[model samples]
Target: PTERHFYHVLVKHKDVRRPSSLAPRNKGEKITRSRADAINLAQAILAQHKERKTWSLDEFVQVVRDFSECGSAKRDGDLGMVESGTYTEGFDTVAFSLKSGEVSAPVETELGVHLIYRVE
Candidate 1:
């Protein structure tokens, strides 16, 4: 008997090797990053969400979907009720560790940097 969880995630890729390689986001914020910067960016994004903890699940999902680089973003980063074996070890480790309604700090996986919101 395995338990499954549903969660939302936001990802930011390590898009640049140099600070000068900055590019503007949809809202016109030009930021530059290396691998470490991706981690910091994830933290900043999650921090903005900290005060909005009372937001509905759908609202949380929308933000993850809007900023994520992963295809799961299309579905609002919904992994659709997954058990331990469903995702990579790194992703699963963090995903399974979170309590419901808790958002994680930056988690790094082979796919990229992720900010997870455990929804259910």
Candidate 2:
């Protein structure tokens, strides 16, 4: 399919204009403006979700609400219908590669790191 529906939790670095917006645990702490830190965070979330052994949109939705910095988190991370190039090269590559209900590894894009859930 040229286009598909999916959900994604977007996270950004502090250096970026929108630092994932997730409050830091430590007082005076800031989300690091580093790719390693950002991607590692994404990886950690993915690890927790995958521990369920089987994935669910319901579970994914919660992940979005908890970690997503994008405005769509308000809508449960639903990105609506999307096609290749709709977002960015890295995102589209993973967004289209998933087999429905399958979650992607941390995907890197200019907006931030992403955890894409293709609905197939």
Candidate 3:
């Protein structure tokens, strides 16, 4: 296995903003930003990041790394290198192009936007 490297990312404030809209209510439907809504927002971001073809790998990394809160948020979402065929199609597409220590721009996936920085 290759040694893992640590990457530093600088994400823009706009990159993490989740899209918001008035909830659709059909008479009896409840409208509120529930926990499920938060989860959905996170998932939406992931989905968009999976299929992004507009930005380069470097550009994508910069966008994502800043949004990620691995230390304050979670540990599993750390930006780093992965083996082949592990990430989603869009993720693998952009991530595959970079060498170690390379940072990418904001990329779209099934869940949302991401900027990946490969540590090792």
Candidate 4:
């Protein structure tokens, strides 16, 4: 378990500053920026990631880059050799828990929602 590795992540920011009109709404329903909305979006992205996991890891990284908000999205979300002290407690915990070449379910960090992929 001490082996070093790399990972890619796709993050969805919690306080995204787009126009309120851009938020999804139900028929005749008003939209509110709430934890529920964030979770829903995370779950939706997790579902997409689950389907995409069958693709090659390179292909999956590209898909993450296309939708991620984090700066590392520019590099296909690559976080190289992340060890125990490398990231936040939540992120570190989840990243290490995943098996090699596995994509995780939606993980909530203080930063936002994350879909993590253990690349190598």
Q: Best candidate per lDDT, number?
A: 2
TM-scores, all candidates, are 0.61, 0.69, 0.38, 0.59
Model 1: lowest-lDDT 10 consecutive positions: 17-26
Candidate 1 lDDT over residue span 1-120, tens digit each: 464565555454446332221122323333344666566656655666576565356766666655554443145456666778777666677677877777765565554557667775
TM-score of 1: 0.61
Checking candidate 1 for backbone clashes, the offending pairs are none
Off by over 4 Å in 1: 14-41, 51-56, 72-74
- The C-alpha RMSD in Å for every predicted model, in order, reads 6.1, 5.0, 11.6, 7.9
- Candidate lDDT (C-alpha), each: 0.58, 0.69, 0.44, 0.56
- Of the candidates numbered 2 and 3, which has the greater TM-score value? 2
Q: Could you give candidate 2's per-residue lDDT for residues 10-111 as a string of tens digits?
A: 777766655544333433446555756666666776687654676777767777766666654245456877778877767788787887888887776665
| C-alpha positional error of residue 13 in candidate 4 after TM-score superposition, expressed in Å | 4.2
Lowest summed lDDT across 10 adjacent residues in model 3 is found at 21-30
lDDT computed for candidate 1: 0.58
Write candidate 3's Cα lDDT for 1-120 as tens digits.
543333332222223343332222323233244444444444444454566534334543444433343331333345455565766775565566656655554565543444555554
Tell me the deviation in Å of residue 116 in model 2: 0.4
| Clash count of each predicted structure | 0, 0, 34, 0
Give the per-residue lDDT digits (tens) of candidate 4, residues 1-120.
Answer: 363465555444336443122222333233355655555654654466564445356755665655554553244556666568777666677678876777666666655666777775
Error of 1 at 17 (Å): 11
